[PDB]
Amino acid sequence: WRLWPSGDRSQQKDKQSYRDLKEVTPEGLQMVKKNFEWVAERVELLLKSESQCRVVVLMGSTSDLGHCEKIKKACGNFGIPCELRVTSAHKGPDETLRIKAEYEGDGIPTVFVAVAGRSNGLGPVMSGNTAYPVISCPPLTPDWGVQDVWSSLRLPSGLGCSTVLSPEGSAQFAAQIFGLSNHLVWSKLRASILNTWISLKQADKKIRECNL
Amino acid sequence: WRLWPSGDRSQQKDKQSYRDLKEVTPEGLQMVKKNFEWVAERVELLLKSESQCRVVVLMGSTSDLGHCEKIKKACGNFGIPCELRVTSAHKGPDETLRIKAEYEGDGIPTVFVAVAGRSNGLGPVMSGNTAYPVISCPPLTPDWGVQDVWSSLRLPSGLGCSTVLSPEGSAQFAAQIFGLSNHLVWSKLRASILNTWISLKQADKKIRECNL
């Protein structure tokens, strides 16, 4: 590669420093060696997380636990810790705000994912009382899902609450948010775009052989 | 009329006490007079309210004030005091519960009417945190009303919150609730069933003449 500290070619730390020498002298090789040492001393820091990430999944009912387990598993795939908590906006709004405060108050950047069946008040109430992002991922089924989804979508002014129907999708969106700050999360998202694209090419190649 | 204290014919206080005398003696007429005095001393109490009534209309936004004015006016027609208050479940749930507590705490029987456009969380949150009845009367328009109504209708278990779409209707329902305890409110409801029925007979009589 070619590596320029501060975008400055004259500070090049890569092997171009050796290619560029008119004549290789022993003083010339010690400069090249120090450039290689400079990179060797920094490269292990590429494995370290610069910023902390957390998803908190708030569920109105323990019957939606299966749906929340899918979000937590999918968060695990991006290396983002994910906590489950049980709270109802309708039946314990005092407790919802106290739980919110626990995660707002310890200095760890947090995305809240609200899982509320039927009339979703948990997304909205959370959204109205935190500066952190809130994602409604309601556990819609085909029975009443067309009716229930609108309680996540049509909100009073002054609420940023977003909607993602897929539980794997809500994890991915939470990852994309943390990817703006965390190169490790970003890189898993980037490699996943590649791997998914590769999978389509391989499935097309297979079905093309069944075209003769 | 015939008036029997405790349903006991032998305690009859009406003119039947005079009709029933085999012979009218002066001692017989003094008994009749005391029966008439007994009724004269109690009849003014029929004008007095035995129980207090109040409707509290909670609105999420001052833009829904017109809709709340219609509820308040219609409550006035049943002689039920009606207060307007502004509170959002989404943006000030702490304040919603403190306002609720003011009306729960002064010993006056109260019906709460929740007016919240779009995703109604105000009905549900109120319903989950008071033993008093809550009526959602959402200000639906034809634009999004088919979508918004389901946030009032499909609630988690443990919530009694009812729905009435008409604002005059929500007042009438509040009146019907107080009519179980208040003979004056009951009587306005009863006379209104008569007057409305009379109006239909009169409109049918009119249109029948335009049938020749």
Short mmCIF file of C-alpha atoms in Angstrom, two decimals:
data_model
loop_
_atom_site.label_atom_id
_atom_site.label_comp_id
_atom_site.label_asym_id
_atom_site.label_seq_id
_atom_site.Cartn_x
_atom_site.Cartn_y
_atom_site.Cartn_z
CA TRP A 1 0.00 0.00 0.00
CA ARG A 2 0.80 3.77 0.11
CA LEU A 3 0.19 5.31 3.60
CA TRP A 4 0.41 9.13 4.01
CA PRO A 5 0.13 10.53 7.59
CA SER A 6 -2.21 13.63 7.47
CA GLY A 7 -2.59 13.03 3.66
CA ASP A 8 1.05 14.34 3.22
CA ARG A 9 3.00 12.38 0.53
CA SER A 10 6.34 13.77 1.88
CA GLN A 11 5.57 11.86 5.21
CA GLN A 12 4.97 8.53 3.26
CA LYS A 13 5.65 5.58 5.65
CA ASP A 14 5.29 2.71 3.07
CA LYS A 15 7.93 1.02 0.76
CA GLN A 16 7.61 3.96 -1.75
CA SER A 17 10.20 5.69 0.57
CA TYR A 18 12.72 2.94 -0.56
CA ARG A 19 11.58 2.93 -4.27
CA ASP A 20 12.11 6.81 -4.38
CA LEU A 21 15.84 6.78 -3.23
CA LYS A 22 18.16 7.84 -6.14
CA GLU A 23 20.93 5.73 -4.46
CA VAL A 24 20.58 3.23 -1.54
CA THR A 25 23.04 4.29 1.22
CA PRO A 26 23.16 2.83 4.78
CA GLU A 27 21.71 6.20 6.06
CA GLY A 28 18.93 5.74 3.39
CA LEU A 29 18.06 2.18 4.64
CA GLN A 30 17.83 3.38 8.34
CA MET A 31 15.15 5.96 7.26
CA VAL A 32 13.25 3.15 5.37
CA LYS A 33 13.56 0.87 8.46
CA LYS A 34 12.14 3.65 10.79
CA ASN A 35 9.18 4.12 8.35
CA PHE A 36 8.49 0.30 8.55
CA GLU A 37 8.84 0.47 12.41
CA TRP A 38 6.41 3.43 12.49
CA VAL A 39 3.76 1.29 10.72
CA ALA A 40 4.56 -1.87 12.80
CA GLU A 41 4.02 0.16 16.06
CA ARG A 42 0.56 1.47 14.96
CA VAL A 43 -0.97 -1.48 12.98
CA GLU A 44 -2.28 -3.38 16.11
CA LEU A 45 -4.43 -0.30 17.03
CA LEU A 46 -6.57 -1.12 13.89
CA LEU A 47 -7.97 -4.09 15.90
CA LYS A 48 -9.19 -1.80 18.75
CA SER A 49 -12.68 -0.22 19.04
CA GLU A 50 -12.37 3.60 19.29
CA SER A 51 -16.00 4.04 20.59
CA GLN A 52 -18.46 1.94 22.70
CA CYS A 53 -21.83 0.74 21.28
CA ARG A 54 -24.96 -0.68 22.97
CA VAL A 55 -28.51 -1.62 21.83
CA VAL A 56 -31.24 -1.68 24.56
CA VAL A 57 -34.38 -3.57 23.44
CA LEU A 58 -37.41 -2.51 25.49
CA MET A 59 -40.41 -4.93 25.26
CA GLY A 60 -43.95 -4.18 26.58
CA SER A 61 -44.63 -7.94 27.22
CA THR A 62 -42.60 -11.17 27.83
CA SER A 63 -44.74 -12.83 25.08
CA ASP A 64 -42.65 -10.80 22.51
CA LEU A 65 -39.40 -12.32 23.94
CA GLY A 66 -38.87 -14.55 20.83
CA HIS A 67 -38.93 -11.42 18.59
CA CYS A 68 -36.43 -9.62 20.95
CA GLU A 69 -34.10 -12.71 20.99
CA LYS A 70 -33.82 -12.31 17.12
CA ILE A 71 -32.73 -8.61 17.52
CA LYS A 72 -30.18 -9.59 20.25
CA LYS A 73 -28.74 -12.49 18.17
CA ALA A 74 -28.45 -10.26 15.04
CA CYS A 75 -26.71 -7.52 17.17
CA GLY A 76 -24.18 -10.21 18.31
CA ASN A 77 -23.23 -10.69 14.58
CA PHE A 78 -22.01 -6.97 14.43
CA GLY A 79 -20.18 -7.32 17.86
CA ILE A 80 -22.65 -4.85 19.56
CA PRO A 81 -23.72 -5.73 23.13
CA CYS A 82 -27.58 -5.92 23.38
CA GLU A 83 -29.66 -5.85 26.62
CA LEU A 84 -33.35 -6.90 26.99
CA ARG A 85 -35.61 -5.02 29.47
CA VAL A 86 -39.38 -5.35 30.18
CA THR A 87 -41.38 -2.09 30.59
CA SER A 88 -44.87 -0.86 29.48
CA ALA A 89 -45.51 2.80 28.52
CA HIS A 90 -49.24 2.20 29.23
CA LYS A 91 -48.98 0.39 32.60
CA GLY A 92 -45.61 1.63 34.03
CA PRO A 93 -44.56 4.91 32.31
CA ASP A 94 -42.76 6.02 35.55
CA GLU A 95 -40.60 2.82 35.30
CA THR A 96 -40.00 3.29 31.49
CA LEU A 97 -38.46 6.78 32.19
CA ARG A 98 -36.32 5.45 35.16
CA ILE A 99 -34.95 2.57 32.92
CA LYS A 100 -34.31 5.10 30.10
CA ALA A 101 -32.36 7.25 32.64
CA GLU A 102 -30.10 4.25 33.60
CA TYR A 103 -28.88 3.98 29.95
CA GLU A 104 -28.77 7.75 29.25
CA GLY A 105 -26.69 8.31 32.43
CA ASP A 106 -23.57 6.03 32.20
CA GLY A 107 -21.83 7.67 29.16
CA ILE A 108 -22.24 4.69 26.73
CA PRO A 109 -23.75 5.64 23.30
CA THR A 110 -27.08 3.76 23.10
CA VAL A 111 -29.75 2.94 20.47
CA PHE A 112 -33.17 1.99 22.02
CA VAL A 113 -35.32 -0.52 20.06
CA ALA A 114 -39.00 -0.44 21.17
CA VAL A 115 -40.93 -3.72 20.73
CA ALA A 116 -44.66 -3.11 21.49
CA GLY A 117 -47.53 -5.14 19.96
CA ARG A 118 -50.91 -3.55 19.08
CA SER A 119 -51.03 0.24 19.89
CA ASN A 120 -47.28 1.06 20.22
CA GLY A 121 -46.94 3.85 22.89
CA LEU A 122 -43.44 2.64 24.03
CA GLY A 123 -41.61 3.91 20.89
CA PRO A 124 -43.31 7.32 20.95
CA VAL A 125 -42.98 7.93 24.76
CA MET A 126 -39.25 6.85 24.64
CA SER A 127 -38.71 8.96 21.48
CA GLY A 128 -40.24 12.04 23.19
CA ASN A 129 -38.02 11.78 26.32
CA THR A 130 -34.47 10.88 25.04
CA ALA A 131 -31.96 12.60 22.73
CA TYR A 132 -30.70 9.08 21.73
CA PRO A 133 -32.24 7.40 18.66
CA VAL A 134 -35.36 5.16 19.07
CA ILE A 135 -36.37 2.45 16.53
CA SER A 136 -39.86 0.88 16.75
CA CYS A 137 -39.62 -2.80 15.65
CA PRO A 138 -43.21 -3.95 16.31
CA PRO A 139 -43.95 -7.74 16.28
CA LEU A 140 -46.56 -7.51 13.42
CA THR A 141 -48.36 -10.71 12.26
CA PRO A 142 -50.69 -10.84 9.16
CA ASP A 143 -53.83 -10.88 11.44
CA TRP A 144 -53.77 -7.18 12.60
CA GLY A 145 -50.29 -5.94 11.39
CA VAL A 146 -51.76 -3.68 8.63
CA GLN A 147 -53.77 -1.91 11.46
CA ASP A 148 -51.09 -1.90 14.27
CA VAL A 149 -48.15 -0.46 12.14
CA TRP A 150 -49.78 3.04 11.90
CA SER A 151 -49.31 3.59 15.72
CA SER A 152 -45.48 3.43 15.00
CA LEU A 153 -45.68 5.55 11.76
CA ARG A 154 -48.06 8.54 12.39
CA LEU A 155 -46.62 10.51 15.36
CA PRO A 156 -47.20 14.05 16.77
CA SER A 157 -44.65 16.73 15.69
CA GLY A 158 -41.37 16.85 17.71
CA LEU A 159 -40.80 13.00 17.62
CA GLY A 160 -37.95 11.46 15.53
CA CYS A 161 -38.97 7.81 16.25
CA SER A 162 -38.10 5.63 13.13
CA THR A 163 -39.75 2.28 12.05
CA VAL A 164 -38.06 -0.97 10.89
CA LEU A 165 -40.37 -4.03 10.56
CA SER A 166 -37.61 -6.74 10.25
CA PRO A 167 -36.01 -7.64 13.62
CA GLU A 168 -32.67 -8.58 11.85
CA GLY A 169 -33.20 -5.26 9.96
CA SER A 170 -33.49 -3.21 13.22
CA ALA A 171 -30.14 -4.68 14.39
CA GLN A 172 -28.55 -3.83 11.02
CA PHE A 173 -29.92 -0.27 11.20
CA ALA A 174 -28.57 0.05 14.79
CA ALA A 175 -25.18 -1.23 13.41
CA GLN A 176 -25.26 1.30 10.51
CA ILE A 177 -25.77 4.08 13.16
CA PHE A 178 -22.76 2.85 15.20
CA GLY A 179 -20.77 2.34 11.95
CA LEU A 180 -20.52 6.18 11.66
CA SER A 181 -18.22 6.08 14.78
CA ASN A 182 -16.90 2.45 14.89
CA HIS A 183 -14.67 1.18 12.03
CA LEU A 184 -15.06 -2.46 13.26
CA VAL A 185 -18.90 -2.33 13.00
CA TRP A 186 -18.62 -0.39 9.70
CA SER A 187 -16.29 -3.14 8.30
CA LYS A 188 -18.74 -5.96 9.19
CA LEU A 189 -21.50 -4.03 7.33
CA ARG A 190 -19.15 -3.42 4.34
CA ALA A 191 -18.02 -7.08 4.13
CA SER A 192 -21.68 -8.23 4.48
CA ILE A 193 -22.65 -6.11 1.38
CA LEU A 194 -19.84 -7.95 -0.49
CA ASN A 195 -20.70 -11.47 0.79
CA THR A 196 -24.44 -11.02 0.01
CA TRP A 197 -23.55 -9.80 -3.53
CA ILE A 198 -21.18 -12.80 -3.96
CA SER A 199 -24.07 -15.15 -2.85
CA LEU A 200 -26.37 -13.73 -5.61
CA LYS A 201 -23.64 -14.23 -8.30
CA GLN A 202 -23.19 -17.91 -7.05
CA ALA A 203 -27.01 -18.63 -7.04
CA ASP A 204 -27.30 -17.08 -10.57
CA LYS A 205 -24.35 -19.25 -11.75
CA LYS A 206 -26.10 -22.39 -10.32
CA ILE A 207 -29.58 -21.73 -11.89
CA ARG A 208 -27.91 -20.77 -15.23
CA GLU A 209 -26.57 -24.40 -15.52
CA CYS A 210 -30.26 -25.59 -15.14
CA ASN A 211 -30.99 -23.48 -18.31
CA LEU A 212 -29.67 -26.18 -20.71
CA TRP B 1 -99.84 9.55 42.04
CA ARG B 2 -99.44 6.68 44.59
CA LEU B 3 -96.26 7.08 46.76
CA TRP B 4 -95.23 4.19 49.09
CA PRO B 5 -92.26 4.82 51.45
CA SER B 6 -90.00 1.66 51.39
CA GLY B 7 -92.50 0.09 48.87
CA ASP B 8 -94.99 -0.36 51.82
CA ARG B 9 -98.64 0.32 50.76
CA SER B 10 -99.69 0.66 54.46
CA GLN B 11 -97.32 3.77 54.66
CA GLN B 12 -99.03 5.36 51.53
CA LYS B 13 -98.54 9.19 51.70
CA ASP B 14 -100.74 10.14 48.65
CA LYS B 15 -104.54 10.95 48.40
CA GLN B 16 -105.35 7.16 48.41
CA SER B 17 -105.14 7.54 52.27
CA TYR B 18 -108.29 9.81 52.00
CA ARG B 19 -110.06 7.64 49.32
CA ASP B 20 -109.59 4.52 51.62
CA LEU B 21 -111.37 6.00 54.76
CA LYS B 22 -114.72 4.17 55.41
CA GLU B 23 -115.97 7.43 57.08
CA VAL B 24 -114.31 10.91 57.04
CA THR B 25 -113.87 12.04 60.70
CA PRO B 26 -111.84 15.11 61.85
CA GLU B 27 -109.18 12.65 63.25
CA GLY B 28 -109.21 11.00 59.73
CA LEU B 29 -108.58 14.38 57.94
CA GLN B 30 -105.60 15.24 60.30
CA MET B 31 -103.89 11.94 59.24
CA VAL B 32 -104.54 12.83 55.51
CA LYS B 33 -103.17 16.37 56.14
CA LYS B 34 -99.94 14.96 57.79
CA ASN B 35 -99.47 12.61 54.74
CA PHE B 36 -99.76 15.70 52.40
CA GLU B 37 -97.31 17.64 54.71
CA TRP B 38 -94.89 14.67 54.61
CA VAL B 39 -94.77 14.89 50.78
CA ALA B 40 -94.64 18.76 50.77
CA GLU B 41 -91.55 18.64 53.11
CA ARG B 42 -89.62 16.19 50.85
CA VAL B 43 -90.61 17.23 47.26
CA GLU B 44 -88.01 20.11 46.99
CA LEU B 45 -85.17 17.55 47.57
CA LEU B 46 -86.05 16.10 44.07
CA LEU B 47 -84.40 19.26 42.61
CA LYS B 48 -81.07 18.56 44.41
CA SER B 49 -78.09 16.59 42.98
CA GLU B 50 -77.24 13.64 45.30
CA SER B 51 -73.75 13.10 43.70
CA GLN B 52 -71.10 15.34 42.01
CA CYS B 53 -70.03 14.80 38.34
CA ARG B 54 -67.04 16.12 36.33
CA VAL B 55 -65.61 15.48 32.83
CA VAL B 56 -61.87 16.29 32.32
CA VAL B 57 -60.92 16.54 28.62
CA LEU B 58 -57.17 16.01 28.14
CA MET B 59 -55.83 17.18 24.71
CA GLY B 60 -52.31 16.41 23.34
CA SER B 61 -52.29 19.69 21.26
CA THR B 62 -54.02 23.14 21.31
CA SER B 63 -54.82 22.58 17.57
CA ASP B 64 -57.56 20.07 18.73
CA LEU B 65 -59.16 22.82 20.92
CA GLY B 66 -62.19 23.18 18.53
CA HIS B 67 -62.95 19.43 18.96
CA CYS B 68 -62.63 19.75 22.81
CA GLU B 69 -64.93 22.87 22.84
CA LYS B 70 -67.68 20.61 21.25
CA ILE B 71 -67.29 18.02 24.12
CA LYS B 72 -67.41 20.84 26.76
CA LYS B 73 -70.50 22.48 25.18
CA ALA B 74 -72.33 19.10 24.93
CA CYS B 75 -71.43 18.35 28.63
CA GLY B 76 -73.01 21.74 29.56
CA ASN B 77 -76.34 20.44 28.05
CA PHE B 78 -76.41 17.59 30.73
CA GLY B 79 -75.40 20.07 33.56
CA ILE B 80 -71.96 18.33 34.02
CA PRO B 81 -68.98 20.65 34.66
CA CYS B 82 -66.19 20.03 32.04
CA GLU B 83 -62.52 21.16 32.31
CA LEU B 84 -59.97 21.35 29.42
CA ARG B 85 -56.27 20.55 30.12
CA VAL B 86 -53.27 20.30 27.72
CA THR B 87 -50.85 17.37 28.24
CA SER B 88 -48.91 14.96 25.91
CA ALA B 89 -48.27 11.30 26.87
CA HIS B 90 -45.36 11.29 24.37
CA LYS B 91 -43.65 14.58 25.34
CA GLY B 92 -44.70 15.09 29.02
CA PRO B 93 -45.83 11.74 30.55
CA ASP B 94 -44.59 12.92 34.03
CA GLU B 95 -47.00 15.94 33.73
CA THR B 96 -49.91 13.72 32.42
CA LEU B 97 -49.68 11.57 35.64
CA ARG B 98 -49.42 14.70 37.95
CA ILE B 99 -52.58 16.23 36.25
CA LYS B 100 -54.36 12.85 36.55
CA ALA B 101 -53.46 12.84 40.31
CA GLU B 102 -55.06 16.34 40.80
CA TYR B 103 -58.47 14.97 39.63
CA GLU B 104 -58.14 11.52 41.29
CA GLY B 105 -57.25 13.19 44.64
CA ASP B 106 -60.10 15.68 45.48
CA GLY B 107 -63.00 13.17 45.96
CA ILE B 108 -65.08 14.27 42.89
CA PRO B 109 -66.18 11.37 40.60
CA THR B 110 -64.46 12.03 37.23
CA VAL B 111 -64.62 10.72 33.63
CA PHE B 112 -61.42 11.51 31.59
CA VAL B 113 -61.88 12.06 27.82
CA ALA B 114 -58.55 11.70 25.90
CA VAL B 115 -58.30 13.73 22.66
CA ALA B 116 -55.07 12.74 20.80
CA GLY B 117 -54.62 12.96 17.00
CA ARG B 118 -52.52 10.39 15.05
CA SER B 119 -50.99 7.66 17.34
CA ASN B 120 -53.15 8.04 20.51
CA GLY B 121 -50.91 7.20 23.55
CA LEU B 122 -52.82 9.60 25.91
CA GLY B 123 -55.93 7.36 26.21
CA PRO B 124 -53.92 4.18 26.83
CA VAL B 125 -51.39 5.73 29.34
CA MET B 126 -54.29 7.43 31.27
CA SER B 127 -56.35 4.19 31.11
CA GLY B 128 -53.39 2.17 32.53
CA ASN B 129 -52.84 4.53 35.52
CA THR B 130 -56.37 5.43 36.83
CA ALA B 131 -59.28 3.41 38.26
CA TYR B 132 -61.66 6.09 36.80
CA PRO B 133 -63.10 5.53 33.30
CA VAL B 134 -61.19 6.85 30.21
CA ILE B 135 -62.87 7.54 26.82
CA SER B 136 -60.69 8.13 23.72
CA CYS B 137 -62.47 10.65 21.43
CA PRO B 138 -59.82 11.10 18.70
CA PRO B 139 -60.22 14.03 16.23
CA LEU B 140 -60.33 11.75 13.09
CA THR B 141 -60.63 13.37 9.61
CA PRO B 142 -61.18 11.34 6.36
CA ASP B 143 -57.47 11.81 5.35
CA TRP B 144 -55.85 9.37 7.90
CA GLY B 145 -58.78 8.54 10.30
CA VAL B 146 -59.13 4.91 9.05
CA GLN B 147 -55.39 4.44 10.03
CA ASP B 148 -55.31 6.51 13.31
CA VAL B 149 -58.46 4.92 14.98
CA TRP B 150 -56.68 1.52 15.55
CA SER B 151 -54.25 3.15 18.11
CA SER B 152 -57.42 3.81 20.29
CA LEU B 153 -59.02 0.34 19.58
CA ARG B 154 -56.24 -2.35 19.82
CA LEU B 155 -54.73 -2.10 23.34
CA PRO B 156 -52.54 -4.42 25.50
CA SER B 157 -54.41 -6.60 28.07
CA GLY B 158 -55.25 -4.88 31.42
CA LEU B 159 -56.61 -1.62 29.79
CA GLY B 160 -60.37 -0.77 29.87
CA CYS B 161 -60.03 2.37 27.66
CA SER B 162 -63.27 2.76 25.53
CA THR B 163 -63.67 4.58 22.11
CA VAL B 164 -66.38 7.05 21.00
CA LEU B 165 -65.73 8.87 17.67
CA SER B 166 -68.48 11.58 18.01
CA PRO B 167 -67.48 14.44 20.36
CA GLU B 168 -71.22 15.08 21.26
CA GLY B 169 -71.37 11.24 21.65
CA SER B 170 -68.46 11.17 24.18
CA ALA B 171 -70.31 13.77 26.31
CA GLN B 172 -73.52 11.70 26.12
CA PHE B 173 -71.61 8.54 27.11
CA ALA B 174 -70.00 10.45 30.04
CA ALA B 175 -73.59 11.58 31.00
CA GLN B 176 -74.93 7.98 30.76
CA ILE B 177 -72.10 6.94 33.20
CA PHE B 178 -73.07 9.71 35.69
CA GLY B 179 -76.78 8.92 35.12
CA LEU B 180 -76.26 5.67 37.12
CA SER B 181 -75.73 7.90 40.26
CA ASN B 182 -77.41 11.26 39.34
CA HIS B 183 -81.20 11.35 38.75
CA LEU B 184 -80.95 14.89 37.24
CA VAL B 185 -78.45 13.75 34.53
CA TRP B 186 -80.45 10.52 34.03
CA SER B 187 -83.66 12.60 33.50
CA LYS B 188 -82.03 14.81 30.81
CA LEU B 189 -80.95 11.62 28.97
CA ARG B 190 -84.48 10.12 29.36
CA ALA B 191 -86.26 13.29 28.13
CA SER B 192 -83.76 13.56 25.21
CA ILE B 193 -84.73 9.99 24.05
CA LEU B 194 -88.38 11.19 24.08
CA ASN B 195 -87.73 14.56 22.32
CA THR B 196 -85.58 12.90 19.58
CA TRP B 197 -88.34 10.28 19.02
CA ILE B 198 -90.97 13.09 18.87
CA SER B 199 -88.76 14.92 16.24
CA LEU B 200 -88.75 11.78 13.99
CA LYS B 201 -92.59 11.44 14.22
CA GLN B 202 -92.90 15.23 13.27
CA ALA B 203 -90.43 14.93 10.28
CA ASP B 204 -92.30 11.76 9.07
CA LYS B 205 -95.64 13.64 9.38
CA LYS B 206 -94.19 16.55 7.28
CA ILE B 207 -92.72 14.39 4.44
CA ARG B 208 -95.94 12.26 4.36
CA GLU B 209 -97.91 15.41 3.26
CA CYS B 210 -95.38 15.72 0.30
CA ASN B 211 -96.56 12.18 -0.72
CA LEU B 212 -99.75 13.48 -2.44
#
